[PDB]
Amino acid sequence: GERKISRIHLVSEPSITHFLQVSWEKTLESGFVITLTDGHSAWTGTVSESEISQEADDMAMEKGKYVGELRKALLSGAGPADVYTFNFSKESCYFFFEKNLKDVSFRLGSFNLEKVENPAEVIRELICYCLDTTAENQAKNEHLQKELEHEEGKILRAQLEFNQIKAEIERKLAEKDEEMEQAKRNHLRVVDSLQTSLDA
Amino acid sequence: GERKISRIHLVSEPSITHFLQVSWEKTLESGFVITLTDGHSAWTGTVSESEISQEADDMAMEKGKYVGELRKALLSGAGPADVYTFNFSKESCYFFFEKNLKDVSFRLGSFNLEKVENPAEVIRELICYCLDTTAENQAKNEHLQKELEHEEGKILRAQLEFNQIKAEIERKLAEKDEEMEQAKRNHLRVVDSLQTSLD
Description:
homodimer; Single alpha-helices involved in coiled-coils or other helix-helix interfaces; 2 domains; DNA repair protein XRCC4 (chain A)
């Protein structure tokens, strides 16, 4: 499975940072879990393939493009001119969000979150995922850095060796010219003998 | 400012993962802030250099080695067989940790932590820092993959260009051979012309 954790600011509580965790399998379009935490409580709702189709329809937007909009608002892919506002009432537990443009905002989704009974568990799992991902990446990055240095060396030595082989082969060019010069000189000797005989 | 967030399990609650957040500047030896959280409550204390020195002194341990054990236990660098356990009372807020060996334990250090009155703010700050760290490491992974790709390309390029340069020099070498040959034929004509011009 996959996830994305984002920092958002809620309209009703812009004072502070809420964390949004969206997890799914293979594609967002086949449904996803969305979790919201303020570091003390957490709210979780699932969103089904049907509910995504339904919101795409209730909006007169093509399903593909709409899923794109969800990727940009809830995950990544958001260009820098993309601005979203996020709303969540801790009373009704309705979560909705909008895309701000050059004219007005238009809503993109309305999901129902349910307050979870053990927030601390959810928060702990989130943090463990961050630390695990960080440790794996650090390990892979140190290894890649070993691969870079080794390649840097392989390059220097291969170049050295290539230039020695080239310097060796290009000498046989000089040797060929010296041979041809000696053969020419010898030919002139031969002809000279025959012509000295012929001029008498 | 430097930070380190580790996962630990308290002997008091083995089922639950707790987070030790240690923050300091330059070295632990100059003191540090330590924070413990279970994702709901948070407890914080500060340790001064004096307290660190006093700890090493009371243990009859050489200062630098004591600081090394603090690094192993609270941060990173713990060898494959180094075992540290952590004990914390939520009622008393007394926190200590021991080094465990085959056949003997010994206490390494104790702090009196104090329950913070807004844990959710501390936990949010901590999560923000982990999200930053993760995104930075992921970005560095992408960059490093691209840079390796590029260097491998350089190696391949040099090899294939060398191959082609070598084949070229060896076409020059055979060029000079066709030249040698037709010179031979000319030489034969000139000599046979003179030789019949004799007879």
